[PDB]
Every structure is written in C-alpha cells, then in structure tokens.
Amino acid sequence: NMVALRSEANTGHMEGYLKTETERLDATGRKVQKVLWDPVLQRHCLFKETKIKGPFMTKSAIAKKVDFPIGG
Amino acid sequence: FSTFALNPETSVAPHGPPRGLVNRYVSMGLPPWAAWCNKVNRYSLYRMSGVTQRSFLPKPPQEMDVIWLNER
Amino acid sequence: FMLAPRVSAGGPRNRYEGKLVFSPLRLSKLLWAIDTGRINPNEVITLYHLRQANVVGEREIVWPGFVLISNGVRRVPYPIHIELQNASAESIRLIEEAGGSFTCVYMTHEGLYQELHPEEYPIFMDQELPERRGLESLATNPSKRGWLTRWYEDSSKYAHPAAGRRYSHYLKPPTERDFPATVEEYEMVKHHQKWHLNQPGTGTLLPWHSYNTADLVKRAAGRL
Amino acid sequence: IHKGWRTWEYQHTRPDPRPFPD
Amino acid sequence: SEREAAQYKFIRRWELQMRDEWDQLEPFKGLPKPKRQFGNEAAEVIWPYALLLERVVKVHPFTKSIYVYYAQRQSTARGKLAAEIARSFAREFLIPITFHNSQVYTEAEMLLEYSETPWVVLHSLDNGQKPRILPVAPVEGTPAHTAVEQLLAEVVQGCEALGASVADPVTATRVLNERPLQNQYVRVDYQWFGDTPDERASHLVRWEFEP
Amino acid sequence: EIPKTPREYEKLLERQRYDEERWKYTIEYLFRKYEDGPPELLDR
Amino acid sequence: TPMMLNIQNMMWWNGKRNLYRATYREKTWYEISRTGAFTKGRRPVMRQKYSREALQAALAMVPPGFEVADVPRPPQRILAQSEGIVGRWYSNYWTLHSMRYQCLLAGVEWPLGERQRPRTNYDEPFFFADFEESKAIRDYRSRWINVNRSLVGMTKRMKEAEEEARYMQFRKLQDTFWSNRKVLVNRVKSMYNQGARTSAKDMPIKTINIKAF
Amino acid sequence: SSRFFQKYFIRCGNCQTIQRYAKGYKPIPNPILFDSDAHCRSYHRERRDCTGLTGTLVTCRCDKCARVHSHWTVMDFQEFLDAKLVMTPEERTALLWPGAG
Amino acid sequence: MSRLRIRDHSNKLRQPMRLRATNADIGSGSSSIEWERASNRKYGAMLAPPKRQDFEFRVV
Amino acid sequence: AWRPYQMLKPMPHNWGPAVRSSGVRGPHMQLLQERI
Amino acid sequence: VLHKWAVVSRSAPPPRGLRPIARTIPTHPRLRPVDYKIPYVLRTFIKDRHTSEVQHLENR
Amino acid sequence: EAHKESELHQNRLRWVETMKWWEEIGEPHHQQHAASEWEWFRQRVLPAKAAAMGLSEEDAARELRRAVMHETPRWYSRIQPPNARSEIKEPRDQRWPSSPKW
RNA sequence: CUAUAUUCUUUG
RNA sequence: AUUUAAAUAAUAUUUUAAAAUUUAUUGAA
Ligand SMILES: [Zn+2]
C-alpha cells in the first residue's frame, strides 16, 4: 500500500512510504507516525500518515496561536 | 486579465500590456477564438479579423421576396 | 526525443518578448579599437559611434544593444567615457579605476532606432521610458550605474504628499481617507488580515493566484 | 475537395478545352 | 422552465406582502443594524443607488458627526415650518452625506415635546473642541424646497468653519485616517448595477479631465 | 437597447422604471409610511 | 455552397467561379491585409510642406473657440489620410497635427489648444509597485509563522512517538507467543493421537515432556 | 471589455447640455477559468461599444441638472463641432463644460 | 542535426543552423542590402515589447 | 557608502522538474491551465 | 547522490553525530542468521528508552 | 390527471392553488393598491412638487410619471434587491495561504 | 501524452 | 561574465506505372 508521511511541523514536506504488512493489516485504528529528516526545516520532525493525492498544504493545517512563555 | 479581487476602472491598463494568450488577440482586435487556431499565417488572420464579411443571401437581392434587412 | 522529458514549458533557452539577450561587446575589442585609432578617447562613446566607426557590424546589433564584458583585460590605462547597456561589474570597476565613466543606458526599441539613425529626426522627440523589469534591474540600478538613479532617488521613491499607506502606490489618492471606504472592501480586508496572520502589510489586498510571467519577475538572489 | 490540388504552381491562363471546338 | 417558476415566485411574493410574512432585509444579512429610534427611519429605508449618485454632498474631512434633533409637536405657529425643514433635511441629506463622507456619523431624533426650535449638532475630530450647534431659521418668505438647500449650505459652511478652527491637524489627520467605517448600516438597492463589486463601488471612481 | 438575455432585460426594466415612473424614486414615496411620526405613536 | 465544401472554382482553373462573391474587388485580400499602408504607423500622412506665411494663413482660417482636444484620434479601421488644407481642415485629426508639426518646425505660434490626456482617480504611475513578490513574501511569511506555531513542543511529542511504536511492537510480539504455544501443543496432541512417539530431541522445545500433556 | 480607452460627447436630453463621457480599461474575464459564453458576447459588445455605443442605452447623470437618467444622445465629434462652433460664447457657458471657450 | 543541414547542400564552407536563433541569425535578415530601407524589423523588433500605443488607440 | 553584500529574499522558487506545467512563462504565452 | 552540477540541489544532510543508525539483525528470513531465535522474552514493558536499552546491555 | 402519484399531483395542485389565488382576490388588490397609492401621491406630494419643481399641477404629473408601467407576473424585473456584500472567494480547494492552480 | 500533486518530495 | 575561431549564404533533391479517390457535366432505369 502507498501512503504519505507528511511533516507534522507544517512545511508540506511529504515522503512516500510503503506500509509494512503489519501496518497494511487493519489490526489497528491509528495513523502511522515516524521521526524523519525534514529538509525544509533542516531538522528532525514527526511525520504523520496522510493521503498521497491531496493538497499537502490545506487550510485545516493551521496550528492555533500559542503564546510562548519566553520573553515578556 | 487581472488576478486582483477588486478592479476599479483605469484609464490605461496599470500593469503594462495585459498578460495571457487571449489578451494578445484582444489587443490585436481579433476575437477570442484565435487561441484555438493552428494556422496563424496572413490569410487566416485576415480571415478571422472580420473586416471582410463572408455570408450570403438565399436569392439575389432583385429576386429577394422576404424582408431580410440585415440577416445574411 | 520523447524519451527525454519536457522542461520549463517555454523551453530552456527560449526567447520571449522582452527577454534581455545582449550581444557581447568585449572590452578588449573596444580598447583595441581605441588604441588602433578608430575611436576618440576624447569623446563619450555611444552605440552610434561604435556603429559608425565600423567596429560593430549591423548584424550584431539587436535589442537590447550590447554588454561590456572584460575578456582578458586586467586594467585600463587611460580614462574612457562610455555609454552602453548592462556592463558586467568587473568591466565597470576596471573603467572606474582609471578615472573613467560608465552610464548604463537602457533603451526601448524606438530608442535604438533613434540613436542609430539620428539624422532622420530633426527635433528631439519624446522618448519612452523603458519597461518595468528593465527599470528595476538596469535604469534605476546604482550597481550597473543606470541613468535613472537620480530620478529614482529624487522623484520616484517618494509617494504622493497627501497619500496614506494603502494608497501610496497610486499617482493621486483615489479617496481622502486612508481607511478602506467600502463595507465590502472592509469585510474583505478583515478576512485578509485573519487569512494571512496579522503581519504589518496585510492591510493592502494582494490576490491569491499568480501569473508566473517573466515580465513581473525579479532577481531571486545575487550580489547586490 | 477531399484533397486540394496544387494550384499554386500554375500561372493563371485558361487551358484549351480538350473536346476542342471546331 | 424558468418563466413559470418566476411567475410562481412573484404571486407568492405578493401573497406574503398582503399577509405580512415578507422579509425585506434578506439581501442585508451581512450588514450591522441601524438605530431603531424615532427619527432614524431614514436609515431602515432601502435607498436606491441612483439618487445617492444624484445627491453627492461632501463636507469638510474634519467633521466626525452630524445630529439633527427635532420636536415631535410644535406649539408655535411657525414651529411647524422649522420642524418640516428639519425633517426634510434629516430625510434628504443625512444618509447621502454619511454615504459619501464615510467618517461622518449621522443621526436624527424625534424628541417628544412642544418645542419650535430644532437644532443641528456638528462635532469635529477634536475631542477638546466644543460642538457647534446651528439653529434652523426658516425665513417666512422661503418655501420648503428652498430653505432646505439653505440649511444644507449652512451645514456645509458650519462644518468647514469647524474644520479650519482645529488645533494642530497632524492629530486630527491620523485620527481621520484611523477612524473606522461609519456608513455600514446604510441599505442600498443597487439597481441595474449589481453584477460585480466594482460598479458597486462605482461612485468612488471619478474622471479627471485636463490635468 | 434590445436585451439578448433575461437579466439584461431586468436591468433595462429597472433603468426604464427609474426614468418613466420617477415619482417612485422621490423621497416622499420612499417615506409613505412616514407622512407623520413613527407608526407606533398612533391610535386604534 | 461549394466554398464551404472547399472547391477551388477559380476561372483560370476550371472555368467556373464561386457564386456568392463580388465581381469586383478594388483591393484584394493581400493589400487589405497590409495594415501598415492603411493605418498610420511610422508613416507621414500629409505630403505637402507649407512655408511660414502659408501656415499663418491656414491657421487664420480656423474659427475661434476651437480646441484640439475635441478631435479624437480615429480608430484603426479608419484610413489615415489628409486632404491637405481644405475648408474645415481642422476637423481632420491627422491634418490638424501634421500642421501642428510644421508649425513646430517653422517656429509659428500655435493658437489652438493642445491634446489632453484624461485620467481616472485610480490611476497608477508608470513605474508601478509590484504585487507579485510582495504576495509571495507575505504568504510565505504566513507559512513560516504557522511553522513557528506548529513546532512548539515538538521534541517531547517525537519522544513519545517512539515509545508508542515500541509498545505497539512489543504487545503483539508477546501475544504472538501465547498464540504459537497453544498452536504447537495442539499439534503435539494431534501427533500423540496417531501414536507417533516423538523423542525429546527432535522437538524444537527440547525440555518438553509430552506425557505431561 | 473594455480593452481600450474612448472619449464620447453626449447630450443631456432633458435640458440639452453637452457633456463628455469617458470609457476606461476594465479587464477580460479570466482566461484560466474559461467561459466561452462570457468571453464571446463580451467581444461582440466590445466591438459595439467601440462604435458610438450603437446598441447601448446610455445611462449617466447630468451635471447641469443633477440626476441620473438615460435620455443621453451620443454624438460623433463632427456633429459636436457643428453644434459647438455656431454658438455664442455665453451659451458655451450654459450648454458646454467648463472653459471650452 | 541532419535536418538542420539541409538548407545548403554543396555549400561546404557553411555551418549548420543552431537550435535557438542567435543574435547574428536574427540580425542577418535585417542587415542585408535589400532590407536597409525597411525601418520596420530593423535592429530587431518582434523580439522587443511593443510600443505604447496612443492613449486613445483602439483596434475596432 | 555601505550597500549590503547580498540580497536575501524569503520568496519561493517557481520551478521544479517533477512538476509538469511549472516554470516562468513569456508574457503573451498561454498561462497555466488556460482554456479549461 | 546529487552533486553540485545537478539541476536541483538539496539542503544539508543530517549531521551524523545525532540519531545514529543501529546495526539491526536483518529481518529477511533468507538473510537472517540461523541461530538467531525469535526474541520472546516475557517482560514488563519499560516505556522510557533510557532503561529499555540497558536491558540490551550486560555491564555488571 | 394522476392523483395516486404523490409529488406529481400535489405540486401541480400547489400550482393551481397559487394561480387560483391570484386572479380572484390577489390581482384586483394589487391593481387597486397601485391605483390607490398614485392617488395618494398626487393630492399630497404632487401639490408640493408642482410648487417645488416649478411646473403646474398637471404637467408635473406627466413629468413625474411619463408612462404607466403596472406590474403583472410575467413582466416583473426582480423579486428582491441584489446582495450588498458578496461572499469572498477562497483559493481552489481549501489551500492555504495560496494556490498555484485555478 | 493529458490531469492530480507546487520548496529539496509525490500519483495514475 | 575567469574565458581563444570563421570563406553570410539559402532557391535543389532520380525516373515510368496501379487497383483508387475527389470535382464538374452527359446519359440509362
Ligand atoms: Zn440635463
């Protein structure tokens, strides 16, 4: 089977991933997630399972505004 | 052709010559049909410039029995 | 050829209307022409003087005219005063070190025909400013030393004295008040400021879609 | 005219009709 | 099959107009709602765009507000004339002035007393400046199609004098540029130009000849 | 102007009835409900 | 009609002629096609050049209260020509301006007005601010603010992901065991019914005693 | 519609005062979201607009009497110059636009 | 390349046409002594952006 | 006078090989997805 | 690998010093060593990796 | 005339419902309304504008109503005024911040 | 080849 | 923009042959 591991840090960077037969098996109700190199950030990030044919930057891909503790 | 959401009318097109293939023939004064033409030589351009009007009456005008005032 | 992919829908080296493809003028050719005795050192050297002195052939001439390239030249002994288009940086510094001059003229086609054939026009006639992309990159560029740099630094870079920030680009402000004057336009600006997150420039509407046309594109990155 | 003849290679002069008039 | 459905919808429309089910405000869902008040009935009425194009009246940019107050009952013999001029001016030019000026907020009130003197209150963009209060002074030789334009001229010159009296305009200028949009409650029927926003905004574009 | 589309014709109709019946577009006709004060100030 | 059916009916060819056609063409399609001759680009449209006291007399026959700006430039469809100085020559656009040019050369003062360029409220200058890169830079900016938001607390999350993977692996790994042992003891019993006395060594589980099963 | 700028001389039909009316640049409907039915009739109406507003009912507002009406009559400039040049300078003040002496 | 070599056979002193036309190959068609009176298409025309038309320009 | 040594633009690049219709187009060339 | 003369060039590769590549026994049954037993060891799951890789170690 | 069919019948019955509503009690009322409010206009407003606009009481009536356009269901221009604010066009399929395609 | 993928990566 | 040549002209491309096609007339049932 063919899925897309797309960055959880939303840069829209996806990597084609072929599921192992265990993950191909419907035994579990979860999306696969894996730590990979995101070249767009030049950093290691979490990738999530997502459908390969579809816009990799969707509107719903916006994180809510988080205020940072640091600074005043 | 303007990608802007709001376009108040301007004296001269503000962004320079209008982009796109259709605006080429529009600026030439040709119909929008010309984007579908393969033969672009002098004769075809003359043909579709519309200066010559090709159409006819069913009978010669002396023999015309119905009022076709302008309908060719 | 079908085994090879297409690239860059126009084609790789593709001409379009307004691609600036310069014919080269090597600085060595010029200096040879000057030290040989074709051309005055005493005189501002235009493209006209180059054509008349026969150093460049009619066939070579095309829009835009020429580029001054320094090929095999590490110095210029005497000062030269020259007007060409789009010289390389090293040629410009090689001229300027001598105590010379360079002015990067950039011409619309009409300009070329009016400089190469001056005799035809008795009166100085109103000449067009060159187009937008060429004004960005050449005429108003201090690095290439274009000729509109004073005009940019005096007239162009300042907005209208009345103008607000949103109406800044307009020749005359369309309305008095800077605030968007239509309830629909205001709703749209609100949606724009929450669309893009709230950045300083978000007040002015910029359309979401693009041309991908070469007449609006400018330099991606390069030496300033 | 399923296929157009090459008429551009002829200069314009009327050929004589083959059943020629006496 | 468009024509008969059209018919259907028209008869339906008149039926609901006889029986009071018809909502005249549906095109207006996105707009804020004006003041429901005894003088402000000039606001809820749907204005044709054409006669808004007809009355183009601009005042000084440093005007933020125009209030027109008039008495419901006029004890005075000439009181009625004053009230009528005030009423007519409140109905004819208040909405247009607001429409074109767009920083000016305009409100008319029917205040219930027997009082013969209606007044107009003009506020400038200075908080520190007192408002100017102009009386309605009908001359007894002037009818109600003339005196109203006289009152209009008075309001214009009043706003102008109020705006040229302003302590330093730098402040007033930035306050003007940042004052939000006041004409949002206006309901305009765009008749024969509704098709795209650009001719909705068509009253903004002005041709300048001989520059 | 001969309309070749129905909406073109309702545009034509609208400018027409703005021209011929213009008494419709005077402010007194807009104000038919107020020739007097507001309607809630009345009697039954 | 045969022209629709594309027949070449030229008279030099077969003797026929196309039936719906004009029998006289004063200019055929080629010389209609050349718009350089017809339109005025780069071409002089008035071929006589008048002396000073000629120009002054020609200007003297213009009626007062006339502006140049009242004479719009005719479209491309209209032929560009000038009839010279005729009566009412100032109504002719090209004559008007050609005369203007002679009056500029001869140093004759030009009594009439000059051509006005009407402009709108919303007009932009020629060197006009760019919308494309301002757009690309601001929407990109938007994307990276979004990235700044989405990346908050990323390292911990990516720490837990590995633990979830190890757990999900481990559980099914240890379930597989209890599956396979009951499988293999079932097969031990199903080998013990057929009377095959299996030694302890050729069993994979080599401490196994079958009598205990 | 409309690709090119054009100037017209129109007469207000109620009061018979001549004012000038201009038509500027409005862009073509998008070639990328394509509609033949939009583009083509826009083309024919464009040609029409270019010729004297032949099939168009003109709607504008009188300056000398301020109202919006479609009574306007579009004049080709020779009829304008016939109308203008026979006038006394004081009625140029009433009937025509500012200046135009 | 062979398709580009068929403009002159038996002209051995020539060199084949290139893929994209160079500036010499554009100018060669206006630099002849048969074109010297043509002020159209001189010094390259059709590769430049068009002249700004008269502010009242219209093709109808 | 000191002019900075290199321009830095956050702007994205407009072309990649694996994308079919991408790349910078002549101004009067047909645009992407024209005549749909 | 993309050298610098390519059409597209990519960003910096991952620094080798962080998040190494484990030497893992190949799970392919033809490439798996013979004596490698399928690792059933019945164990309480220790969820942090710090201790869970100590179990794979004998240092006493 | 099928009745046993549900929406084929009750919908054309809805139609005859609607169009026997009109020409009996609806139409005379609509016409009478149109007559009555012009009758309202000409003795209350018009006497003011005859004085205002500078005409007589008669020729002001020919000026303010130049023609009689009475509205019948097959002639009506619009049911309701076109929307003041039209909703904003998002990019193609919920892309953010922008889409390359159309 | 045309469509869907529009950053260094991706479908039929 | 580190970085060397050049004789600027094009016009041509075997030969004879089907069963066919197309166009416009005449005639027969
Ligand atoms: Zn008038």
> DSSP readout, E60-90?
-TTEEEEEEEEEEE--STTHHHHHHHHHHHH
Contact E118, E71 (CB under 8 A): yes
Q: Looking at beta carbons, which residues of chain H come within 8 Å of J29?
A: none
Residue C123: CB atoms within 10 Å: 8
Nearest 5°: the CA angle E85, F34, F15 is 90
Interface mutation vs chain A, best among G144, G147, G160, most A CBs within 10 Å: G147
Q: What is the CA radius of gyration of chain A?
A: 14
How many CB atoms are located within 10 Å of the residue C117 CB? 14
Resolution of the structure in the document, Å: 3.4
Within 8 A of H28 by CB-CB distance, chain B residues are 1, 18, 20, 22-23, 26
Q: B32 and H24 in contact by Cβ < 8 A?
A: no
Number of H helices, E strands in chain F: 2, 0
- Verify whether the Cβ–Cβ distance E209 to G122 is below 8 Å: no
Can you read off the two tokens belonging to residue G98?
């050609």
Cis status, amide bond into H2, omega within 30 of 0: yes
Strands H60-61 and H68-69, by their bridges, are antiparallel
Q: Please report where in the chains the tokens 């050609």 appear, as a residue.
A: G98
Whether residues G162 and A35 touch (CB distance < 8 A) is answered with yes
Nearest nt to the CA of C91 via C1' is N1
Query: In this complex, do H4 and I57 lie within 8 Å of one another by their Cβ atoms?
Result: yes
The residue among H52, A3, J23, C209 whose CA lies nearest residue L98 is C209
Q: What is the DSSP letter of E164?
A: T
Q: Which of E101, E80, E81 is nearest to E163 (CA)?
A: E101
Q: How far is CA G156 from CA A10, G162, G163, L73, in A?
A: 17, 10, 11, 70
Question: Which residues in K lie closer than 8 A to residue J16 (C-beta atoms)?
Answer: 8
Is G46 annotated among the ligand-binding residues? yes
K11, K18, K19: residue with CB nearest A39: K11
Closest CA to D15 of L52, A58, G11: G11
Residue C64 preceded by cis peptide, ω within 30: yes
Nearest alpha-carbon partner for E11 in F11, L83, L23: L23
C-alpha dist (Å) from residue G131 to B4, G31, G135, G136, H37: 9, 44, 6, 9, 30
Interface of I with G (CB under 8 A): 39-40, 54-60
Q: Quick one: closest CA in E to H24, which residue?
A: E207
Q: Which of I49, I55, I59 sits opposite B28 (nearest CB)?
A: I59
- Against chain F, the chains showing at least 3 CB pairs within 8 Å are E, H, L
Question: Which CA distances in Å does E147 have to E82, E140, E150, G153?
Answer: 10, 10, 5, 72
Q: A interface toward L at CB cutoff 8 Å?
A: 55, 57-62
**Tokens 């054009």, located at residue:** H6
Pairing type for strands C101-104 and C81-84 reads parallel
**Residue whose token pair is 């052709």:** B1
Q: How far is CA K36 from the centre of its chain?
A: 17
C6 CB neighbours strand M below 7 A:
yes
Name the token pair of A33.
Answer: 């997630």
Distance, Å, I43 CA → N3 C1': 28
Chain G residues near residue L95 by CB distance under 8 angstroms: none
Give, as ranges, the nucleotides of chain N with any atom within 7 Å of a protein CB.
1-13, 21-24
How is residue H29 written in tokens?
């409907």
Strands H17-23 and H6-12, how do they pair?
A: antiparallel
The answer to whether residues C79 and C60 touch, using CB atoms and an 8 Å cutoff, is: no
Cross-strand partners of A16: A4
Cβ atoms of G9 and G17 within 8 Å: the answer is: yes
Q: Give the span between the Cα atoms of E162 and E124, in whole angstroms.
A: 7
Residue B5 (CA) to nucleotide N28 (C1'), in angstroms, measures 75
- The residues close to strand N, meaning Cβ under 7 A, are C 22, 24, 26, 28, 59, 67, 69-73, 86, 88-91, 223; D 1-3; G 2, 5, 7, 14, 16; I 6-9, 11, 13-15, 24-25, 28-29
CA-to-C1' span, D15 to N14 (A): 30
Nearest neighbour of C221 by CB, restricted to J4, J7, J29: J7
H helices of G34-92, in order, are 35-38, 52-60
How many Cβ pairs within 8 Å bridge chains B and C? Answer: 21
What is the C-alpha radius of gyration for chain D, rounded to an integer number of angstroms?
A: 12
- Measured distance CA(H9)–CA(H21) in Å, rounded: 6
Give yes or no for a contact between C161 and C147, defined as CB atoms under 8 angstroms apart: no
E-strand spans in chain H?
6-12, 17-23, 60-61, 68-69, 73-75
Q: How far is H98 from chain B (nearest CA, A)?
A: 21
Q: Which residues 1-36 in chain J have a CB closer than 7 A to strand M? A: 12-13, 16, 18-22, 32-33
Nearest residue in L to A59, CA atom: L96
Closest residue (Cα, C1') to N3: C71
Chain A residues touching residue K19 (CB < 8 angstroms): 35, 44
Which of F19, F24, F25, F27 is the best mutation test for H, with the most CBs of H within 10 A? F19
- If you measure CA to CA, which chain B residue comes closest to C185? B6
Three-class SS of residue C23? strand
Q: Do B5 and C188 touch (CB under 8 A)?
A: yes
Annotated binding-site ranges of H for Zn(2+): 12, 15, 62, 65
**DSSP-derived 3-state class of residue L62:** helix
The Cα C199–Cα G145 span in angstroms is: 10
Tell if the CB–CB gap between L95 and A59 is shorter than 8 Å: yes
CA-based nearest distance H43→chain I, Å: 11
* H58/M10 CA-to-C1' distance in Å: 56
How far apart, in whole angstroms, are the C-alpha atoms of residue E31 and residue L81? 14
Q: What is the CA(G74)–ligand 1 centre distance, in A? A: 28
The two counts, helices (H) then strands (E), for chain E are: 7, 6
J10 touches chain G (CB under 8 A): yes
E192, E205, I10, E172: which is closest to G119 by C-alpha?
E205
Q: Which two tokens stand for residue H92?
A: 């140029």
Question: Between chains, do G167 and K45 touch, taking CB under 8 Å as contact?
Answer: yes
List, in sequence order, every beta strand (DSSP E) within chain E: 47-48, 63-73, 105-114, 119-124, 132-135, 188-189
CA-CA distances (angstroms) from residue L96 to C186, G139, L77?
Answer: 21, 9, 40
F38 in reach of chain E (CB within 8 A): yes
Sign of CA dihedral A6, A11, A12, A14: negative
Establish whether G156 is an annotated binding residue: no
Q: Closest by alpha carbon to E54, among L69, B36, D5, F25?
A: F25
Q: Which residues pair with H18 in a beta bridge?
A: H11
